[PDB]
Amino acid sequence: EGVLYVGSKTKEGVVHGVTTVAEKTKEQVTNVGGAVVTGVTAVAQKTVEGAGSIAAATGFVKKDQ
Amino acid sequence: EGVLYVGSKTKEGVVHGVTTVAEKTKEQVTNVGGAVVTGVTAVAQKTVEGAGSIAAATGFVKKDQ
Amino acid sequence: EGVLYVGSKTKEGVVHGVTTVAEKTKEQVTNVGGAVVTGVTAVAQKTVEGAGSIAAATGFVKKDQ
Amino acid sequence: EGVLYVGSKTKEGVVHGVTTVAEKTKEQVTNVGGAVVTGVTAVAQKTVEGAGSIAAATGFVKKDQ
Amino acid sequence: EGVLYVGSKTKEGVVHGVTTVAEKTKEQVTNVGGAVVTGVTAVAQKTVEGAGSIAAATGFVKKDQ
Amino acid sequence: EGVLYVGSKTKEGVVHGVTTVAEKTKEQVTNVGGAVVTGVTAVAQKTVEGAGSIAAATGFVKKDQ
Amino acid sequence: EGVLYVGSKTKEGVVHGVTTVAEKTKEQVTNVGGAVVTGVTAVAQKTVEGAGSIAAATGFVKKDQ
Amino acid sequence: EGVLYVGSKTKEGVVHGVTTVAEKTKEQVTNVGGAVVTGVTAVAQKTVEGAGSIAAATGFVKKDQ
Amino acid sequence: EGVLYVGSKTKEGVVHGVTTVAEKTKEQVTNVGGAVVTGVTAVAQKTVEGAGSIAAATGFVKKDQ
Amino acid sequence: EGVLYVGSKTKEGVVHGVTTVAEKTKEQVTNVGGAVVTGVTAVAQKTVEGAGSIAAATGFVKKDQ
Amino acid sequence: EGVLYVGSKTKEGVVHGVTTVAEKTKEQVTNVGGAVVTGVTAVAQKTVEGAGSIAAATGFVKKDQ
Amino acid sequence: EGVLYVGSKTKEGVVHGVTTVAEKTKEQVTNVGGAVVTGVTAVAQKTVEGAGSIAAATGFVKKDQ
Amino acid sequence: EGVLYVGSKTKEGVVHGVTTVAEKTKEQVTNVGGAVVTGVTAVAQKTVEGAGSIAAATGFVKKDQ
Amino acid sequence: EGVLYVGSKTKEGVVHGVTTVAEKTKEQVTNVGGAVVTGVTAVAQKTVEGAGSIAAATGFVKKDQ
Helix, strand or coil: CCEEEEEEEECCEEEEEEEEEEECCECCEEEECCCEEECCCCEECCEEECCCCEECCEEEEECCC | CCEEEEEEEECCEEEEEEEEEEECCECCEEEECCCEEECCCCEECCEEECCCCEECCEEEEECCC | CCEEEEEEEECCEEEEEEEEEEECCECCEEEECCCEEECCCCEECCEEECCCCEECCEEEEECCC | CCEEEEEEEECCEEEEEEEEEEECCECCEEEECCCEEECCCCEECCEEECCCCEECCEEEEECCC | CCEEEEEEEECCEEEEEEEEEEECCECCEEEECCCEEECCCCEECCEEECCCCEECCEEEEECCC | CCEEEEEEEECCEEEEEEEEEEECCECCEEEECCCEEECCCCEECCEEECCCCEECCEEEEECCC | CCEEEEEEEECCEEEEEEEEEEECCECCEEEECCCEEECCCCEECCEEECCCCEECCEEEEECCC | CCEEEEEEEECCEEEEEEEEEEECCECCEEEECCCEEECCCCEECCEEECCCCEECCEEEEECCC | CCEEEEEEEECCEEEEEEEEEEECCECCEEEECCCEEECCCCEECCEEECCCCEECCEEEEECCC | CCEEEEEEEECCEEEEEEEEEEECCECCEEEECCCEEECCCCEECCEEECCCCEECCEEEEECCC | CCEEEEEEEECCEEEEEEEEEEECCECCEEEECCCEEECCCCEECCEEECCCCEECCEEEEECCC | CCEEEEEEEECCEEEEEEEEEEECCECCEEEECCCEEECCCCEECCEEECCCCEECCEEEEECCC | CCEEEEEEEECCEEEEEEEEEEECCECCEEEECCCEEECCCCEECCEEECCCCEECCEEEEECCC | CCEEEEEEEECCEEEEEEEEEEECCECCEEEECCCEEECCCCEECCEEECCCCEECCEEEEECCC
């Protein structure tokens, strides 16, 4: 149950979403957990129903080693 | 149950979604967990129903080693 | 149950989705978990029904080694 | 149950979402837990229903080692 | 139950969301727990229903070592 | 139950959200617990219902070592 | 139950949210517990209902070591 | 009038003279004015006799334009 | 009139003369005015006799433009 | 009139002469006026006889423009 | 008239002459006026005879402009 | 008229002559007026005979502009 | 007329001559007027004969402008 | 007329000559008028004969402007 309205009157638009530049790096991590929605009129919905939901988002893990 | 409305009146648009530039790097990771929706009118929905949902998103893992 | 409406009046559009440039790198990973929907009018839906859903997205894994 | 209204009259827009520049670094992590919604009219909704929800977001983990 | 109204009459806009520049660093972490919503008209909602919700957000962890 | 109204008549705007510049550092952490909403008209709502909610946000942790 | 009204007539605006510059530092932590809402018209609401809510925000922790 | 003696007892030799690697460049110039003599026993003589000698060596020249 | 003696007892030698690596540059100039003599036993003589000798060596020149 | 003696008893040698690495530069100039003599036993002589000798060595010149 | 003696008993040698690394620079000039003699036993002589000798060495010149 | 004696008994040597590292600079000039002699046994002589000798060495010059 | 004696019994040597590191600078000038002689046994002679000798060494000059 | 004796019995040596580090500076000048002689056994002679010798050494000059 719900209603979402978007209206965009744009004459000129320049959009960037997730950008990453790595030079001479080691172990660069760009990590996104949900959707990546990008645009002059970007809309995103998400409905997680159900008890006990988990939404993890880790860059990295190092164990023992 | 729901309603989603998008209306976009654009005269000129330039959109980029996920961009990645790696030069001379080691172990660069661009990681997205959901959808990558990109456009002058980008719309994304997702409905996860059911108890106990898991949505993991890891860049990387190193074990023992 | 639901309704999704998109309307896009565009005179000129230039869209890019997932772009990746790797020069002289080692182990570059661009990882997307869902769909990659791209266009002047990009729309994406996803309905995961059923208890216990899993949606994993890993860049990489290194074990023992 | 709810209603969300957005109206944007823009003549010129330049938007960036998540940007990351790593030069000569080691273990750079850009970590986002939810969606990355970006645009001249960026809208994002999320409804997590169900007792016991977890939403973790870690940069990295190092164990034993 | 609720109502959210946004109206933006912009003639020119330049927006940046999360930006990160790391040069010659070690273990730089940019960590966001929720969504990253960015745009000339950026709107974000989130409704976490259910007793016992957890929303953790850690930069990093080092254990034993 | 509630009502939120925003109206912005802007002729020119330049907005930055979370910015981070790390040069020659070690273990720099920029950590945000909620959403990062940024734009000429930035609006953010969040409704956490349910007894016993936890919202932790740590820069980092070092244990044993 | 409530009503929130914002109206902003701005001719020119330049806004910055959370900015951090670390040069030659060790263990710099910028830690925010809630949302980071930034813009020419920045609005943020949060309603935590439920007895026993916890909202922790630590820069860092060092134990044993 | 003169005497030049060279004696080389080498068991293993690896010699390079003038080496040039240009990638993605514009107007790279490697310019040598005299001889390029290269070898495990490289010897070079030059005797310019006569008043008013000129020995020019230019990388490049741009005029008017 | 003169005498030059060289004697080299080498068991292993690795010599490089003039090396140049240009990546993504514009107007790189490596300019040498005399001879380039290179080797495990590199010898070079030059005798310029005559009043008014000139020995110019320019990287580049830009005029008018 | 003169005498020059060189004697080199080397078991292992690694020599580099003029090395230049230019990345993403503009107008890099490596300029040498005399000879470039390089080797495990590098010897160089030069005798400029004659009144009024000139030995110029310029990186670059920009005029008018 | 003169005598020059060199004797070198080396078991292991690693020599570099003129080295230059330019990254992202503009108008870098490495300028040497005489010879560049480099090696495990590097010897260089120069005899400029004649009244009124000139030995100029300029990095660069900018005129008018 | 003169005598020069050098004797070097070296078991291990690592020599560097003129080194220059320029990153993100503008108008860096490394300027040497004489010879650059480099090696485990580096010897350099120079005899300028003749009244009125000039030996100039300038980094750079800017005129008018 | 003269005599110069050098004797060096070295078991291990690491020598650097002129080193320069410029980061993010403008108009850095390293200027040497004489020879740059560098090595485990570095020897340099220079004999300027003739009345009225000039030996100038300037970093830079700015005129008019 | 003269005699110079050097004898060096070194078991381990680490020598640096002229070193310069400029970060974020403007108009840094390292200026040396004579030779730069550097090594485990560094020797330098210079004999300027002739009435009216000049030996200037300026960092920089700014005129008119």
